[PDB]
């Protein structure tokens, strides 16, 4: 039982983004696509196409590591964070 | 003071991979490049070129999040882990 944080309903069919391979509620993925959005809602990579996938057909990587990408200005680092990390889950910190 | 885990010496000049933006000991990055390696040693993305960067000129993203990429077989997930995660730092786990 996984609830979609966009529509609020339990997900039974997923949309798998190609080629970044992130998954989301299928109906919301399509809706998003219909609207002209061509970026992955979670990582912002370009999306070539969306695959339909039933709940039990997927093997998800759950490895948690630091990003470690580097930027030449604090401004560019902030833009990277806004672009890449804001919908990619709660950041893990000692403050927990 | 950051020691290189390849050569073992303290790093004063970094090589910044373009476009994945990971950084490594400059001398080892070049050496690796001289050998014909065109993949980032940390994330395995293709590397277009290597930028030379002094220690204090970089702003690193330290956000720690889960990967969450999905695969259609356990075998493909394992290949992804071997390809993407083995030199990307200690995975964060409760087992700590
Ligand atoms: Zn939804
Ligand atoms: Zn993505
Ligand atoms: Zn992964
Ligand atoms: Zn080195
Ligand atoms: Zn890299
Ligand atoms: Zn980052």
From Swiss-Prot, chains A, B:
Q: Where are the zinc fingers (C2H2-type)?
A: 59-85
Origin: domain of life: Eukaryota
- Known post-translational modifications? Phosphorylated on tyrosine residues.
Q: Where are the RING-type-classified zinc fingers?
A: 4-44
Q: Where is the signal peptide?
A: none
Q: What ranges does the record give for the region HYB domain, renumbered to this chain?
A: 43-96
Positions of modified residues (Phosphoserine):
96
From the Swiss-Prot or TrEMBL record, state where the protein is found.
Answer: Nucleus speckle; Nucleus, Nucleoplasm; Cytoplasm
Q: In which tissues is it expressed?
A: Detected in heart, brain, spleen, lung, liver, skeletal muscle, kidney and testis.
| Family the UniProt entry places it in | Belongs to the Hakai family.
Query: What role is this protein assigned?
Result: E3 ubiquitin-protein ligase that mediates ubiquitination of several tyrosine-phosphorylated Src substrates, including CDH1, CTTN and DOK1. Targets CDH1 for endocytosis and degradation. Associated component of the WMM complex, a complex that mediates N6-methyladenosine (m6A) methylation of RNAs, a modification that plays a role in the efficiency of mRNA splicing and RNA processing. Its function in the WMM complex is unknown.
Could you give the domain comment from the record? The HYB domain forms a phosphotyrosine-binding pocket upon dimerization, and mediates as well the recognition of its flanking acidic amino acids.
Subunit = Homodimer. Interacts with tyrosine-phosphorylated SRC substrates. Component of the WMM complex, a N6-methyltransferase complex composed of a catalytic subcomplex, named MAC, and of an associated subcomplex, named MACOM. The MAC subcomplex is composed of METTL3 and METTL14. The MACOM subcomplex is composed of WTAP, ZC3H13, CBLL1/HAKAI, VIRMA, and, in some cases of RBM15 (RBM15 or RBM15B). Also a component of a MACOM-like complex, named WTAP complex, composed of WTAP, ZC3H13, CBLL1, VIRMA, RBM15, BCLAF1 and THRAP3.
Q: What is this protein called?
A: E3 ubiquitin-protein ligase Hakai
- What is the species of this protein? Mus musculus
Q: Tell me the lineage of the source organism.
A: Eukaryota, Metazoa, Chordata, Craniata, Vertebrata
* Full-protein positions shown: 106 to 201 of 491
């Amino acid at each position: 039982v996984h609830f979609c944080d966009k529509c609020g309903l339990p997900i039974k069919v997923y949309g798998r983004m190609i080629p970044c391979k992130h998954v989301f509620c299928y109906d919301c993925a399509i809706l998003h696509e219909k609207k002209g959005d061509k970026m992955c809602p979670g990582c912002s990579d370009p999306v070539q196409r969306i695959e339909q996938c039933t709940r039990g057909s997927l093997f998800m990587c759950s490895i948690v590591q630091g990003c470690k990408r580097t930027y030449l200005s604090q401004r560019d680092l902030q833009a990277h964070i806004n672009h890449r990390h804001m919908r990619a889950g709660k950041p893990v910190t000692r403050a927990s």
